[PDB]
């Protein structure tokens, strides 16, 4: 199981967002990591490109991975989800329902 915290958060424009994920109940080592976003009620999910505004911190020892999103704007509102990648870093939101990966339950982010 991937335990993603928090479940929801409201931020002001210009603030930063941190989402933390930890892999529990796993006999296996933490591999590649993925982050997904669905802009509010748009109704499609997309992989986030790590870099620039989007800074990941991984601790493979504790099987923990965290995303910080800097310089928030109203356009960053939506739901964010972390997950395990496959095949050496391939990411796709449908992995979340597959036998090949695990994902967190998501974070509902509001930016004012």
């Amino acid at each position: 199981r991937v335990d993603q915290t928090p479940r929801s958060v409201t931020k002001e424009t210009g603030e930063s967002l941190t989402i933390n994920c930890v892999l529990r109940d796993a006999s296996y080592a933490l591999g590649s990591t993925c982050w997904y976003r669905k802009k509010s009620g748009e109704g499609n999910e997309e992989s986030i490109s790590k870099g620039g505004r989007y800074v990941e911190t991984v601790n493979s020892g504790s099987k923990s991975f965290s995303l910080r999103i800097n310089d928030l704007t109203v356009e960053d509102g939506g739901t964010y989800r972390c997950g395990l990648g496959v095949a050496g870093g391939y990411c796709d939101y449908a992995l979340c329902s597959s036998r090949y990966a695990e994902c967190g339950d998501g974070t509902a982010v509001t930016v004012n």
Binding site: Y28, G31, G85, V86, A87, G88, S98, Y100
Partner: protein
């Protein structure tokens, strides 16, 4: 081909699966028993319309190209028909790729259910390897 137990163990050892990513050979043999009943030609259709192919039941939505799937991910870069051969090379090479990331051997749900937590060494007991 329907492998015998020791026959498969020996084949999987020659193909380098013993302790691959820390999983001892018995894991791989047990997984194949419960996924395919040791049958290289095994296929099982899924709810999503994908199919699991071969000795290690590798899925066409993610791992192989079935030749009729728009935008096929084909993460093992193989036709699914390569996974249906008495020669297990392509299946083993794809399994190595799968197990090296993601959830390890949890990628095989029959492993999780029938193998993980057991005396998997039993699956190679009595074999000449």
């Amino acid at each position: 081909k329907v492998f015998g137990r020791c026959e498969l163990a020996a084949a999987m050892k020659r193909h380098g699966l013993d302790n691959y990513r820390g999983y001892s050979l018995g894991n791989w043999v047990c997984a194949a028993k419960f996924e395919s009943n040791f049958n290289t030609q095994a296929t099982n259709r899924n709810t999503d319309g994908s199919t699991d192919y071969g000795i290690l039941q590798i899925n066409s939505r993610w791992w192989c190209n079935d030749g009729r799937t728009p935008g096929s991910r084909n993460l093992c870069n193989i036709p699914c028909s390569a996974l249906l051969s008495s020669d297990i090379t392509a299946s083993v090479n794809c399994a190595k790729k799968i197990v090296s990331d993601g959830n390890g051997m949890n990628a095989w749900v029959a492993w999780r259910n029938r193998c993980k937590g057991t005396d998997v060494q039993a699956w190679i007991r009595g074999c000449r390897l």
